[PDB]
Ligand binder design. Structure first.
Ligand SMILES: CC(=O)O[C@H]1C(=O)[C@@]2(C)[C@H]([C@H](OC(=O)c3ccccc3)[C@]3(O)C[C@H](OC(=O)[C@H](O)[C@@H](NC(=O)c4ccccc4)c4ccccc4)C(C)=C1C3(C)C)[C@]1(OC(C)=O)CO[C@@H]1C[C@@H]2O
Ligand SMILES: CC(=O)O[C@H]1C(=O)[C@@]2(C)[C@H]([C@H](OC(=O)c3ccccc3)[C@]3(O)C[C@H](OC(=O)[C@H](O)[C@@H](NC(=O)c4ccccc4)c4ccccc4)C(C)=C1C3(C)C)[C@]1(OC(C)=O)CO[C@@H]1C[C@@H]2O
Ligand SMILES: Nc1nc2c(ncn2[C@@H]2O[C@H](COP(=O)(O)OP(=O)(O)OP(=O)(O)O)[C@@H](O)[C@H]2O)c(=O)[nH]1
Ligand SMILES: Nc1nc2c(ncn2[C@@H]2O[C@H](COP(=O)(O)OP(=O)(O)OP(=O)(O)O)[C@@H](O)[C@H]2O)c(=O)[nH]1
Ligand SMILES: Nc1nc2c(ncn2[C@@H]2O[C@H](COP(=O)(O)OP(=O)(O)O)[C@@H](O)[C@H]2O)c(=O)[nH]1
Ligand SMILES: Nc1nc2c(ncn2[C@@H]2O[C@H](COP(=O)(O)OP(=O)(O)O)[C@@H](O)[C@H]2O)c(=O)[nH]1
Ligand SMILES: [Mg+2]
Ligand SMILES: [Mg+2]
Ligand SMILES: [Zn+2]
Ligand SMILES: [Zn+2]
Lengths: 62, 430, 426, 430, 426
């Protein structure tokens, strides 16, 4: 299906104060991606810039 | 002649039916209390009595009384036959084992009795329109219990289903994966074509197109009713290409087990937006193939279309359907499998879509309902079984099931079966 | 149609039950006399759930009032709503418990239990479809902590399949009012873990915290604490009394909230809760409610849930709201606070919605949470008991009633088993 | 047939479009609400929907909601399609990086969908009319983002672009040179005919001819709208010499990169002045060639004319035109390049100019729009890059750009690229 | 839509802010009670910028009030527009700062900051699209100079990309009211230079000068000074609340005004300003309002701009005027006074124009100037600091809260760095 860096990205309805996982900026639109394993959210414009799933999820476990 | 039996199970199915018969009464001009002021267009769904009263061909069942107590008190109290509104005593409590083995056991013999009485009034019965929810305790257990009997008593008759399917992120119960995984055996063995539907997809559609920020469940029901009305329009009305209910399955289903098509409707549009565009046949045809308009949260681009039925209704000319389908074919985004060079079934009906007076959906001279057997829906199952695997690894909530007369191994035997189904949709994708 | 048998035990249980009947008779529009005076038909549609109809269009609550002292019965009977209860349902002895668990379980309450069950059987027999039992008591003291568990055992024996629902006010250290609460608590939890199917742990310190830091009451009395508990009491059973988009029976709650057989001790809460002087400024909409629920201050146990993770949460909304908003807030809560939910359950939040909000509120919502942080409440009591039992302080009063030290040791062993089980999945 | 898509970007572009669509609706007799009380003259700019409503073929985009919110509340609320009026959340803040890389990247996929749906309606699409400002953050970043996408999606179609360009003395922002020098890549590589205009020249025009001492931006927009209406007049109306949109470029553009003609209009005059003077063809033809009537503050005498397009509209006859250009050649002031002995492209249209009722432009039987590729415009670049060089020497304002995903080196590559363009405009001058 | 979170700290900040709300609510047509009563729809179009909607159409100012003494809260709450604010945002301790920066930053304010950030988070979460922060404080004393900078550091850490906008009343030699002002100012600006994006320097001496030699007020009180400051407060945020011919967002102002990252300390001003007995004689035409703008007597800081040159100036007009007249007049000012502008920036003047003038005025305009001459204000305070620190006077009060001389040395070193940077270009 989709493994650009190595995980799923499915649409989520985004609200309130949020931040990209790569830009570390704020998302303005009401759309966002989300990996159910990595538990992140991105602009829809930084999908290829992230690391692979293994990197991000092993990072998330600090 | 050309009758259909519409059974409604679970709260979701019962409320969808409450919307659906509301739509039909407006369609055929029948009053909410069952009379008809002034063709046999109503003969498919309504049986006629000597007093001028049209009684629906429906059976409402729920093991708890609340929803059917509401319908027995609502505006449509006078529409239904009193003894086809069947109620139990104990709520299924979101448990497949209760709905199938213990509490749904008692009420099944009366439900099949009423179905038999409805059937005996038919001259040319064609199939069944079962409405239920995958997550619900009654919506899984009772539908399995009922279908195991229906497949042996009326085996030849086709059986069409309309199912609300668990979503990626939206979820209203914790054991939804178990309940769906147990409903899979019914939908595999004793079914012919079942239509998945997802709440979050319609939520996003209503947010984007209808411009309502926060809809209730009635809005979802008023679109699912529109879809089923579009399916049955060829059966209730005249048309250029009337699609029979068995012709329908013969086009949709390539293999015995591959029968889980997506459904979508167009033009889903508000009343304010509609004044500023034309809604030609080409535009509405292109609308169905966007990911923005699918009623299941899955990307069609990640799979291959296998078979698409376009049911046009209203002021549609077949020239336009031809030109639209050619335009669809030239696109390299909409990919079909190599072994189905034909692809598209087309039906055209002369009845425009009816707007519910309190509804939001605009009036349009045309409508197209697109149903697509496609491989992308496999990813919708690859989601849900992965939700199961985490829980059964811990034997998380199993004691409630096993405690109510269920065998433990049925879990594994269920998980195996979907592993065969999810394989097959990939296996035919080559 | 899904009837509930209510039982009061002990002073605290009797008081909270009396306030519960206050609240739900107000909900159903029932007069102090027992005559219906409500506005809508939905009040009377499910009146059989909590009341028996009797001639003259009067409604008697299906409540059983048990206590080993006549003082509490004289208090409730002379209260604002004392006259509603059936005089046959007042079962009481003369000599009090003396804050002794063994007195309640073996000597004083063992005589009166035979009379209590013979009434509870009558109310079960008059019922059309009994669903479960709704008991009020306290794990401190001797009347509730022992006698309510004895009655729990008997009812579980007689009705093995019905749901059993208990609401317990339980001891905290800084607001302790009796010396021997650890003994009674460790002896009562040993039964509650085994027989009861759910248990809603209520702590006085947390309700005082609600009264001070959220409500801003200057002098909160026990009546206000009982009001707060009765709010969630009326909240949880709302789905089997009014219509709704998502109806959740108590068994429906039990199936989704109880993963393993013994992890059923829940932490309740209520929203909205605002001071009188500040309600004019707030927007009651669903996002603000959802913010107010999952705040650690809003919950009714001293457990700060951030020291653990939720196995399951249940939000029972009442009022008119769109389902999209409710599900969106429930999703954002668990995904923004993903560290505080167990990741071996993919979805942790159950949602139910009813169309009749409380009288005076356009919307309300009751919170239930099964969290591992409850272990801290179950730890500290065990740490208190070890302080006393090591030196056998005040074991003479308990051993004089025929009780044994091996029972205390087994009770604490079961306590450590339960706290270990709650710790295992954290 | 013969359609054009009009995209308006930035505050300046949006307000110019507000003037332009006000000028077109009156020219074709369309009401502000889109109806037409009573010939396919409007077909180029308006799409016609079965209710008898004309919807303009336009896309309004601004990354801050203010200006388009005024458009959505003003008199032309009912004219535009509500969904093609696109608004973002955050203002570009006069920053090329914010418009191009950071904020506009979220809305580009929506504006392209709007443009695609507009194009799918168009049967005979020719090109694009992009209106924007060089000084603005949106008007520089978003146009750069959008033109690159259009040049790959619709590479064959023409792309006419209309611009407000920084002036010698008058200016409203500090980093206008940065935005302009960054926009120069877009104009060079993905455009075919960009029409420079500046505020100061039109101000001086209004002071001298229209006899208004202190006008607003509306007065300038009511002249820019007149210029574009004169350009499209050959397309929307019959004429003796109708100039096609591609023929227009074929006569204007001698080399791939020399595509920045000046524009001017005549007779710009007040209602009081015109009664005292005749305004025959010869005098208006002369009126185009003085330095006073240029819309960019440069002296045409300093640069050699390369190509001129005279679009006459109204009561004009070819005899008078040929006589007038004979004199314009006869002059020693209207110089020309040795290698273009034709020089003058001529178009004639029968429709007189339309006067807006609240405007301060007089009614006249004849009008002429002169659009001239000439070397003198190079001086205008020699101005603005010198404004860049002083600031970039100190890295004066750079940290804002680099803070939003912009590479520092792209500044030098921009300054390099303009050094090639100003060379080219000089290299052909020998 | 470009929502702004406002915060008040210290007595001076709370006062000038309590005034800001009275003046910005005058431009919004909001009743003292919080009910809308304005004339035009344009007032209500962008009410969300500086307020939150609540039931009954009551608009509550998105404002956080912070102070270490209850007295200022008592005065503001009992003040004219006191009841408009939310009671919950009144976050305050008991013991005052005692005009000590260390108490504000380390000991007393460090306790309360955990409370203030949680309310700021609530306001930020309720917002649709937050743009930046609008803090009012004074660099004198201990409450403002310490706690405002602590809060700025925290918010800058939590919201790195949002604008931070402070308005600073800062010391002057001849109008000093506290002995330890230089220490507090030196420790506060050492934070402001690093964290803030736009800091507007205000001085009481210049405010008195405007009151005396422009307004001809005989007895100007502190209320008049707060009025004068609040004029520019309302002026700068005009473009994102009303329609205009040239819209200038605060980020647009920042992108145009701040050449290098640390040279962002601006000098405000306002026009027109006339005595009540002489307004009948003036013509309010653009040139006349702009004639007063660039006069050295009209700006709000003691720095006479004639000893320096302007990096950038921003003129935000309000009312109906022609664009050509505006452009001509700004060209003439910077051409005839070319010696007073840096030539390495070719154009120094940003112009913004709003269509809606202030109530009661036909025309108005707000002036911002980033001038090198501001160094004289940062120089003189340092010259005071070096007077005391060289003999360690009053240092025991600061080291008693855990502070060190090394911090004072780095604060002074950073001050010298800032003044050197401002001087390097002049
Ligand atoms: C205008 C207005 O807002 O009035 C409210 C009110 O001011 C507030 C503060 C009420 C008020 O509650 C309290 O003051 C209170 C004090 C101690 C303990 C518990 C409550 C209220 O008394 C409580 C009362 O609640 C009800 O009527 C509910 O139906 C409640 N029933 C009773 O309180 C009750 C009282 C006497 C006799 C019988 C019932 C209920 C709650 C849960 C489930 C069913 C019913 C209401 C509307 C109010 C007042 C009157 C001020 C609050 O109560 C509830 C449960 O909503 C406390 O915070 C909430 C939020 C409300 O805004
Ligand atoms: C007939 C006439 O000319 O009346 C004027 C006036 O006389 C003068 C002197 C006013 C007047 O201002 C003062 O007296 C004053 C005194 C001390 C400090 C500041 C002002 C006026 O009070 C001030 C008042 O201004 C406003 O209403 C503005 O909207 C202002 N808001 C407030 O002053 C205000 C007062 C109370 C409550 C709420 C708001 C404003 C300024 C900037 C941004 C937004 C709003 C006006 C028109 C006048 C009077 C009434 C005499 C002046 O004020 C302004 C900002 O216009 C002071 O010099 C100007 C020029 C005016 O000519
Ligand atoms: N679109 C839509 N979905 C509904 C509706 N009502 C319930 N559902 C869906 O049905 C799913 C849950 O199934 P249940 O409501 O438990 O169905 P049930 O058969 O009554 O289950 P039991 O109560 O245990 O017997 C959820 O995904 C709900 O979203 C409705 O009115 N409209
Ligand atoms: N003729 C005319 N020029 C305008 C108008 N509005 C703005 N401008 C000119 O446009 C230049 C500034 O460009 P901007 O207004 O910043 O364009 P923008 O895209 O909205 O800028 P951002 O908000 O940062 O995206 C200046 O030279 C103005 O003179 C107008 O209405 N008419
Ligand atoms: N919220 C509340 N708590 C009470 C009330 N009465 C007693 N309690 C508390 O709950 C505990 C119950 O103890 P108690 O019932 O008196 O002992 P018992 O009679 O032997 O069961 C007391 O220690 C008190 O801390 C009451 O009316 N309301
Ligand atoms: N414009 C204005 N200045 C004030 C006001 N009150 C005090 N000031 C001045 O600003 C400075 C603030 O000092 P202060 O607030 O008392 O110290 P803090 O409370 O510890 O922050 C004083 O020294 C005064 O010079 C006021 O109400 N308005
Ligand atoms: Mg159900
Ligand atoms: Mg703009
Ligand atoms: Zn990003
Ligand atoms: Zn991943």
């Amino acid at each position: 299906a989709r493994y650009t860096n190595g995980h799923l990205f499915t649409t989520i309805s985004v609200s309130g104060m949020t931040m990209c996982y790569a830009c570390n900026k704020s998302i303005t639109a009401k759309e966002a991606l989300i990996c159910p394993t990595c538990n992140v959210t991105i602009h829809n414009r930084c999908k290829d810039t992230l690391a692979n799933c293994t990197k991000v999820k092993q990072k998330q476990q600090k | 002649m050309r009758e259909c039996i519409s059974i409604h199970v679970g709260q979701a199915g019962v409320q969808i039916g409450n919307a659906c018969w509301e739509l039909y009464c407006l369609e055929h001009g029948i009053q909410p209390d069952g009379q008809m002021p002034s063709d046999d267009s109503f003969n498919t769904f309504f049986s006629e009595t000597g007093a001028g009263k049209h009684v629906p061909r429906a059976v409402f069942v729920d093991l708890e009384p609340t929803v059917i107590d509401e319908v027995r008190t609502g505006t449509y109290r006078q529409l239904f036959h009193p003894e086809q509104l069947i109620t139990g005593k104990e709520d299924a409590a979101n448990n497949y084992a209760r709905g199938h083995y213990t509490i749904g056991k008692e009420i099944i013999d009366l439900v099949l009795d009423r179905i038999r009485k409805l059937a005996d009034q038919c001259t040319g019965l064609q199939g069944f329109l079962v409405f239920h929810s995958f997550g619900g305790g009654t919506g899984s257990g009772f539908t399995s219990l009922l279908m195991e009997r229906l497949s042996v008593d009326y085996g030849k008759k086709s059986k069409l289903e309309f199912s609300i399917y668990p979503a990626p992120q939206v979820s209203t119960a914790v054991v939804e994966p178990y309940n769906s995984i147990l409903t899979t055996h019914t939908t595999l063995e004793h079914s012919d074509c079942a239509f998945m539907v997802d709440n979050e997809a319609i939520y996003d559609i209503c947010r984007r197109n209808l411009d309502i920020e926060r809809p209730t469940y009635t809005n979802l029901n008023r679109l699912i009713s529109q879809i089923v009305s579009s399916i049955t329009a060829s059966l209730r009305f005249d048309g250029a290409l009337n699609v029979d209910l068995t012709e329908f399955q013969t086009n949709l289903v390539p293999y015995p087990r591959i029968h889980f098509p997506l459904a979508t409707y167009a033009p889903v549009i508000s009343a304010e937006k509609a004044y500023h565009e034309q809604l030609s046949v080409a535009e509405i045809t292109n609308a169905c193939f966007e990911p923005a308009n699918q009623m299941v949260k899955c990307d069609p681009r990640h799979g291959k279309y296998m078979a698409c039925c376009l049911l046009y209704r209203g002021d549609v000319v077949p020239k336009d359907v031809n030109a639209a389908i050619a335009t669809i074919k030239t696109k390299r985004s909409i990919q079909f499998v190599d072994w189905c060079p034909t692809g598209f079934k087309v039906g055209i009906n002369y009845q425009p879509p009816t707007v519910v007076p309190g509804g939001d959906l605009a009036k349009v001279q045309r409508a197209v309902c697109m149903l697509s057997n496609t491989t992308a829906i496999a990813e919708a199952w690859a989601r849900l079984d992965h939700k199961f695997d985490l829980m059964y690894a811990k034997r998380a909530f199993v004691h409630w099931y096993v405690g109510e007369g269920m065998e433990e191994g049925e879990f594994s035997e269920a998980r195996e079966d979907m592993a065969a189904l999810e394989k097959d949709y990939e296996e035919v994708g080559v | 149609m899904r009837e509930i048998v209510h039982i009061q035990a002990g002073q605290c249980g009797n008081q909270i039950g009396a306030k519960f009947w206050e609240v739900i008779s107000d909900e159903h529009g029932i007069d102090p006399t027992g005559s219906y005076h409500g506005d809508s038909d939905l009040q009377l549609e499910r009146i059989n759930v909590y009341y028996n109809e009797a001639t003259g269009n009067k409604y008697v609550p299906r409540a059983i009032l048990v206590d080993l002292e006549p003082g509490t019965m004289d208090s409730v009977r002379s209260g604002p709503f004392g006259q509603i209860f059936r005089p046959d349902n007042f079962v009481f002895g003369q000599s009090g418990a003396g804050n002794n668990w063994a007195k309640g379980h073996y000597t004083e309450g063992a005589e009166l239990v035979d009379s209590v069950l013979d009434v509870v059987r009558k109310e079960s027999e008059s019922c059309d479809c009994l669903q479960g039992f709704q008991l009020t008591h306290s794990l401190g003291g001797g009347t509730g902590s022992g006698m309510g568990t004895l009655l729990i055992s008997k009812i579980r024996e007689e009705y093995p399949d019905r749901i059993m629902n208990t609401f317990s006010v339980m001891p905290s250290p800084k607001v302790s009012d009796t010396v021997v609460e650890p003994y009674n608590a460790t002896l009562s939890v040993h039964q509650l873990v085994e027989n009861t199917d759910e248990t809603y742990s209520i702590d006085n310190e947390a309700l005082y915290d609600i009264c001070f830091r959220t409500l801003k009451l200057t002098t909160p009395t026990y009546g206000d604490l009982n009001h707060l508990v009765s709010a969630t009491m009326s909240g949880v059973t709302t789905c089997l009394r009014f219509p709704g988009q998502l109806n959740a029976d108590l068994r429906k709650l039990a199936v989704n909230m109880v993963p393993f057989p013994r992890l059923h001790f829940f932490m309740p809460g209520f929203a909205p809760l605002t001071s009188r002087g500040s309600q004019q400024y707030r927007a009651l909409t669903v996002p603000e409610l959802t913010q107010q629920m999952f705040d650690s201050k809003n919950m009714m146990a001293a457990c700060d849930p951030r020291h653990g993770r939720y196995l399951t949460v249940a939000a029972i909304f009442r009022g008119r709201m769109s389902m999209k908003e409710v599900d969106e807030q429930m999703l954002n809560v668990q995904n923004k606070n993903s560290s505080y939910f167990v990741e071996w359950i993919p979805n942790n939040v159950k949602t139910a919605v009813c169309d009749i909000p409380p009288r005076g509120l356009k919307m309300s919502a009751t919170f239930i949470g099964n969290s591992t942080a409850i272990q801290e409440l179950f730890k500290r009591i065990s740490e208190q008991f070890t302080a006393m039992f090591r030196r056998k302080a005040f074991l003479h009063w308990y051993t004089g009633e025929g009780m044994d030290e091996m029972e205390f040791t087994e009770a604490e062993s079961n306590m450590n088993d339960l706290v270990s089980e709650y710790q295992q999945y954290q």
